[PDB]
């Protein structure tokens, strides 16, 4: 796969600046944080639940294990 033979593109204009003319960290915090928060919110309901379930199974199982190892008056 080589540039010049990838695919066909028509009527698209691209404008760019030399890296020496621009900042490497434009609005890093002012815009970066809002974007991180947004990305985090957008995925949380898909990522977190299974791990919460793991946490619940993990704490429940560990406790149940300890409980089973003690005070069995018979």
């Amino acid at each position: 796969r080589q540039f010049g033979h990838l695919t066909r593109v028509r009527h698209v204009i691209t404008y760019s600046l030399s890296p020496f003319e621009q900042r490497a960290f434009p609005h890093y915090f002012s815009k970066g944080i809002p974007n991180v928060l947004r990305r985090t919110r957008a995925c949380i309901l898909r990522v977190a639940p299974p791990f919460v379930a793991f946490y619940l199974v993990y704490t429940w199982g560990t406790q149940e294990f300890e409980k089973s190892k003690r005070k069995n008056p018979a």
Binding site: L6, T7, V47, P50, F51, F54
Partner: protein
């Protein structure tokens, strides 16, 4: 000399949007080189005779200049190797990279070869875990009907793990990494036929950028983070991912009461342990890895990546949480309620891959009306 170094690197077309999840391929290349470099240097001082193997390792750590850093870099590098391997495979499943069939299947072979390689390396210091790991794993072959036992004794060079075993394992562990390197080069050649997939799962031919300087600098940044993680382990907690029992020389008369596998084998060990049948557990173990070869045939979605698929994402993280559950269970004694949690987690693992995900794929297709 120029070309194929180049048109195979410098002007290699790459998607403009691949994320950090695409950094693991180069990180795996770096883990391989690291293991090979520290490996050769350790091999310059290691002796494979059972009377002197354990000793030669302490000699490396105590008397060879910087022997300790090279050793713990090799030990922890093996851990980094697996962390990267699992991230790499996860990326592939989530983004549908497995549709590159040749690249993917070669990858499955790579995973198996690295597992076998790491197994044999662990046997070399001849501590307690070394000895019982050699015993158990080689015995997986005894599940093979008719010749199983014969194959095991042939591998061992005797009726039990002993001198002949340790000496050939040093030889196997020595050469396998170089074979892995050749297999990985083939891995890349097939990938180059198609170029990389990207987070969207949509062809990126309309927006390619040259690998250099964009991904060369991004890969260097990734390499630095890998080295930081490795050195945090080597310099601040070299034994954290290790097992205290391997600091005890091999004792053929006694298997430690709380023996447990290296952390990166815990999920598979949990699965095997959950089946109260010899052959059944061995088959489940083999299948827990080989099922990766089936993923492509189980793809039902009209879309390549999971980026635009909510339901598939939920099931994907459930699979990851489940592997985390199996990893935890593999580190616990075979007692209640862990025996049942592990059996459920083992069943859930195969159910998510073979049934739930393909089903989520079809449902999502329906919801999009195609």
């Amino acid at each position: 000399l120029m070309k194929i170094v180049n048109n195979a690197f410098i002007d290699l077309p790459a998607p403009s949007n691949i994320s950090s999840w695409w950094n693991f391929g180069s990180l795996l290349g770096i883990c391989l080189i690291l293991q090979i470099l520290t490996g050769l240097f350790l091999a310059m001082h290691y002796t494979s005779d059972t009377t002197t193997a354990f000793s030669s390792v302490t000699h490396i750590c105590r008397d060879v200049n910087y022997g300790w850093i090279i050793r713990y870099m090799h030990a922890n590098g093996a851990s980094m190797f697996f962390i990267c391997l699992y991230m790499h495979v996860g990326r592939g499943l989530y983004y549908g990279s497995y549709t590159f069939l040749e690249t993917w299947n070669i990858g499955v072979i790579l995973l198996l070869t690295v597992m076998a390689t790491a197994f044999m390396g662990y046997v070399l210091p001849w501590g307690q875990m070394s000895f019982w790991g050699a015993t158990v794993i080689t015995n997986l072959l005894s599940a093979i009907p008719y010749i199983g036992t014969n194959l095991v004794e042939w591998i061992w060079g005797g009726f039990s793990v002993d001198k002949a075993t340790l000496t050939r394992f040093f030889a196997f562990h020595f050469i396998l990494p170089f074979i892995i390197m050749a297999i990985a080069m083939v891995h890349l050649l097939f990938l180059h036929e198609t170029g990389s997939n990207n987070p969207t799962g949509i062809s990126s031919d309309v927006d390619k950028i040259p690998f250099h300087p964009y991904y060369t600098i991004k890969d260097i940044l990734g390499a630095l983070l890998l080295i930081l993680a490795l050195m945090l382990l080597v310099l601040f907690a070299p034994d954290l991912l290790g097992d205290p029992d391997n600091y005890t020389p091999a004792n053929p008369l006694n298997t430690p009461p709380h023996i447990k596998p290296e952390w990166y084998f815990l999920f598979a060990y949990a699965i095997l342990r959950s089946i109260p049948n010899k052959l059944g557990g061995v088959l489940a173990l083999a299948f827990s890895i080989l099922i990766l070869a089936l993923i492509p045939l189980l793809h039902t979605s009209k879309q390549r990546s999971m980026m635009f698929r909510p339901l598939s994402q939920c099931l994907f993280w459930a699979l990851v949480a489940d592997l985390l559950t199996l990893t935890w269970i593999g580190g616990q004694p075979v007692e209640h309620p862990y025996i049942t949690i592990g059996q459920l987690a083992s069943v859930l693992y195969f159910l998510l891959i073979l049934v739930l995900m393909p089903t989520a794929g079809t449902i999502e297709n329906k919801l999009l009306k195609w």
